[PDB]
Design a protein around this nucleic acid. Structure first.
Ligand SMILES: Nc1ncnc2c1ncn2[C@@H]1O[C@H](COP(=O)(O)OP(=O)(O)O)[C@@H](O)[C@H]1O
Ligand SMILES: [Fe+3]
Ligand SMILES: [Fe+3]
Length: 896
DNA sequence: AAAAAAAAA
């Protein structure tokens, strides 16, 4: 029966016109084909065509054929009747009131029409193709279950008339795609990644511009003549669409390490070691774990190893995962220069992928595009990982393995990339489970991985590589099977072949250790300090300790476990200084603009471009664990509250950071690089402040103390002594005298891994014949990090009236509306820059309408969710809101 | 009581 064009697919935005369901259907199939040929990484084409066991060309047309059937579920009454249309020729199929999504209908119709063109009736390939297509709106569904010998009728397709028109369309796209035969195999994971492509296809050809243009040249009628024509047209128009979006590949020439970094005279031990023994190893899918100190060129080493594996795997894409928005920003710059130098583009964007990317001027847009420039299309919402190259927060990749809508899109996203995750030592137990499940899915999808780290506990390292190997190899780990990683070297690198699972430790090919920057050992000195009312009266020990610095000069940092304590020290220091030397305070609770300003002048004093510029003073910094995030600091003395060793040794890396540059003059009192470790005095298991034991688990603080004491003042040889300690704090059980504290720590840790497992998509082998796990969830949006999270507040000022102001000075009004009534992005940036990150608590509950944003604001993404904290000013008082009193000190940051 | 991230077709 010749097909009827009265059935539609798109109505909206077309101004009283309709686009025919076939014209969409063909477009989507046209789109997938081009995507298959010009977007998909070559290696990935291979991976997919492998799974179906057929040539790429055949696999190409299959997928295209499948893309054509995506919106077939629209050819029902429930859907068609949404707008005016004449169905007088189509009696039957009267509304059931199920109100079933067209996508759901596609998955329900396909398993029973498909075999009419050779697919195995009740067969897995058919089962998967239908399920996968039925999920083209970011939600899979269960396989159709039925109790009769006429499932088609059982599922509501009961009319000869209607059933004839679905079949017409089944055959129209079959034909236009040149009748491809059914593949013999198809696995869950492959199918998911294909679903992503199919989704990119539909989206691409759904843009209002592209539609309007096809509305001009609609087909005259439903002939194979007319439909063959329509397809082949859209076919030509699609590679355009790729450019507008910036989805064109960024392929990059092979190169040795020095061809790739010509500005580098003397590559270091790590880079030489990697560049030398790696290419021979890198012969396809694998993972590589570099674990090395800071100031060793891990970055260029990464790009290099990435560059090898990329070529080995037919995968020119890149995702770099960073721990923070900031470091993702910085790296996004570096990787872009790297791109410019390295490639001979301008239709390929190097995306930046985190939640504050819009509010960055130099990324976002405000034909002749600048190379690697962002594109409107890629600027949201679930699209980022579709950028050919991208760097972002690690949180962006972890979303792929969380059970949420459209995760198949992001899985597709990554499947052609070479993924690189920096700072793995940074990932807590909850996150580490998401990472393991991602690794497992990247493993099975033939995507190579580079992991970079500073010291890593062997257990984590093992767990991560095991995860990647599990994914690579099809089956999970035996109880009997030996562990893949029993020891880690710092410095060290390690390679893992997917194909045979062989692991090559760096030491295996070279008995010498990898040369790092030589450096003096670190004096670590434990110091008792009197408790006063369950707190730390540091008043004295600061005297004793800071005195040389006040006389002869230098630079030193005090790191306190909480922000409260952080502020009190700066106060206590301040009084003292009434009676050069400078004083600074850093932590989370500062307005953005202010934090970005402090940090800039803090690194400029204590960092490196200060020392080279001789701007480095003759000075104290107080901070919390912001110091553990990347800050170019070099202090002479460091004093920290006891924290876990890994975090102490982390912290301590700021001691004499740049001694290896000749250009530095340590004051005479500074005999050796030193970290002073404050711990309270006691009176049979070590006690610590409640304040401390709520941020770090109690036992671990014990185990660190216990372990530090055991050394008797001994310095820490760096890096010979480090990894040892990191391993040991968790491994040597004799280090925990409090079995109740050590057991809770374990329970708390089990609790974090547990929530995670609840939160992540299936193992690939659990998903082999069934994709529904990927999107299934019951009883809100799943998190990539454990905890009650954080909210952004913004302080406003009330005079004796009270009128709303944005400064204590009450000259800049509180903008109730914004510069066309609505807010420009630049308005938002102004507002957001004022804001402060504040951890969720009980206070969140007890809010009022005067803590909620005005009504204009609600219409702005970045603004709707701000909480407002009033500040009472008279001719600025602490102000109750939530249940406590908030004062935003300008020198000390937010207080409560 | 740290720090950290986090509308589509
Ligand atoms: N031989 C080298 N290998 C790698 N980086 C080098 C080398 N010589 C100089 N550099 C530069 O010195 C800086 C060292 O920083 P890097 O070690 O990558 O990170 P961090 O300094 O944060 O540990 C980088 O800018 C790198 O570009
Ligand atoms: Fe649809
Ligand atoms: Fe569609």
């Amino acid at each position: 029966p010749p097909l009827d064009l009265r059935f539609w697919a798109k109505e909206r935005g077309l101004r009283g016109k309709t686009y025919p369901l076939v014209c969409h259907s063909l477009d989507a199939a046209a789109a997938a084909l081009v995507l298959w040929n010009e977007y998909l990484s070559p290696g990935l084409r291979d991976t997919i065509a492998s799974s179906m066991e057929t040539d790429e060309e055949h696999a190409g047309h299959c997928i295209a054929f499948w893309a054509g059937l995506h919106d077939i579920g629209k050819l029902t009454r429930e859907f068609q009747q949404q707008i005016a249309i004449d169905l007088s020729a189509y009696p039957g199929e009267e509304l059931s009131g199920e109100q079933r999504s067209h996508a759901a209908a596609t998955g329900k119709w396909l398993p029973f029409a498909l075999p009419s063109l050779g697919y195995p009736n009740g067969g897995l390939v058919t089962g998967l193709v239908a399920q996968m297509l039925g999920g083209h709106h970011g939600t899979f569904h269960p396989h159709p279950s039925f109790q009769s010998r006429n499932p088609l009728a059982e599922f509501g397709f009961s009319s000869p008339h209607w059933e004839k028109q679905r079949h017409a369309l089944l055959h129209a796209v079959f034909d236009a795609t040149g009748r491809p035969t059914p593949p013999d195999m198809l696995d869950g994971p492959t199918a998911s990644v294909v679903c992503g492509l199919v989704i990119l296809a539909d989206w691409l050809v759904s843009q209002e511009d592209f539609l309007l243009e096809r509305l001009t040249s609609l087909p005259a009628d439903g002939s194979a003549s007319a439909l063959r024509a329509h397809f082949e047209t859209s076919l030509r128009r699609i590679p355009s669409l790729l450019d507008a979006a910036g989805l064109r590949p960024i392929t990059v020439p092979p190169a040795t390490f020095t061809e790739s970094f010509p500005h580098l005279s003397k590559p270091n031990g790590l880079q030489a070691s990697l560049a030398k023994h790696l290419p021979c190893l890198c012969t396809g899918p694998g993972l590589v774990l570099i674990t090395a100190p800071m100031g060793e060129g891990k970055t260029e080493a990464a790009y290099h190893v990435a560059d090898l594996l990329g070529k080995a795997t037919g995968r020119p894409g890149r995702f770099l995962a960073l721990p923070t928005m900031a470091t993702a920003d910085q790296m996004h710059t570096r990787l872009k220069e790297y791109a410019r130098y390295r490639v001979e583009p301008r239709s390929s964007t190097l995306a930046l992928l985190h939640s504050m990317a819009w509010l960055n001027p130099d990324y976002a847009p405000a034909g002749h595009r600048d190379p690697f420039a962002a594109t409107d299309w890629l600027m949201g919402r679930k699209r980022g990982l579709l950028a050919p190259w991208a760097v972002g927060t690690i949180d962006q990749a972890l979303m792929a393995v969380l059970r949420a809508k459209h995760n198949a899109l992001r899985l597709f996203g990554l499947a052609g990339k070479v993924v690189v995750v920096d700072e793995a030592h940074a990932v807590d137990p909850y996150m580490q489970v998401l990472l393991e499940q991602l690794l497992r899915w990247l493993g099975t999808l033939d995507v190579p991985v580079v992991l970079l780290s500073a010291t890593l506990h062997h257990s984590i390292a093992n767990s991560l590589v095991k995860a990647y190997l599990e994914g690579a190899r099809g089956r999970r780990w035996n109880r009997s099977e030996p562990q893949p990683v029993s020891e880690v070297s710092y410095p060290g690198w390690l390679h893992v072949d997917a194909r045979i699972g062989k692991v090559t430790r760096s030491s295996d090919v070279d008995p010498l250790p990898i040369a790092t920057t030589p450096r003096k050992p670190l004096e670590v000195r434990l110091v008792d300090v009197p408790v006063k009312e369950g707190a730390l009266n540091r008043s004295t020990v600061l005297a004793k300790e800071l005195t040389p610095l006040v006389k002869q000069g230098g630079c030193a940092a005090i790191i306190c476990t909480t922000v409260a304590e952080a502020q009190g020290v700066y106060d206590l220091l301040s009084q003292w200084f009434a009676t050069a030397p400078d004083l600074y305070l850093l932590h989370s609770r500062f307005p953005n603009r202010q934090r970005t300003e402090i940090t800039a002048t803090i690194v400029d004093l204590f960092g490196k471009e200060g020392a080279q510029s001789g701007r480095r003073p003759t000075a104290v910094l107080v901070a919390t664990q912001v110091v553990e995030q990347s800050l170019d600091l070099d202090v002479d003395l460091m004093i920290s509250d006891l924290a876990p060793v890994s975090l102490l040794l982390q912290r301590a890396g700021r001691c004499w950071r740049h001694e290896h540059l000749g250009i530095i003059n340590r004051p005479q009192w500074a005999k050796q690089p030193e970290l002073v470790v404050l711990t309270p005095e006691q009176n049979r298991a070590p006690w610590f402040p409640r304040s401390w034991t709520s941020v770090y688990p109690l036992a671990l603080l014990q185990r660190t103390y216990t372990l530090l004491r055991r050394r008797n003042g001994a310095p820490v040889q760096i890096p010979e002594d480090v990894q040892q300690l990191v391993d040991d704090v968790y491994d040597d059980d004799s280090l925990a005298e409090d079995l109740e504290a050590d057991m809770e720590r374990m329970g708390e840790e089990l609790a974090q891994r547990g929530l995670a497992r609840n939160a992540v998509i299936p193992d690939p082998d659990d998903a082999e014949d069934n994709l529904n796990g990927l999107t299934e969830f019951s009883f809100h949006v799943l998190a990539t990090r454990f905890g009650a999270g954080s909210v952004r507040v913004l302080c406003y000022y009330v005079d004796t009236a009270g009128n709303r102001w944005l400064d204590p000075e009450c000259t800049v009004e509180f903008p109730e509306q914004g510069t066309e009534g609505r807010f420009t992005m630049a308005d938002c940036r102004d507002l957001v820059a004022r804001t402060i990150p504040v951890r969720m608590g009980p206070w969140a509950s007890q809010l009022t309408e005067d803590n909620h944003p005005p009504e204009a604001w609600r219409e702005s993404f970045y603004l709707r969710d701000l909480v407002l904290i009033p500040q009472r000013v008279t001719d600025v008082l602490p102000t109750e809101t939530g249940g406590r009193e908030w004062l935003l000190d300008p020198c000390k940051g937010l207080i409560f």
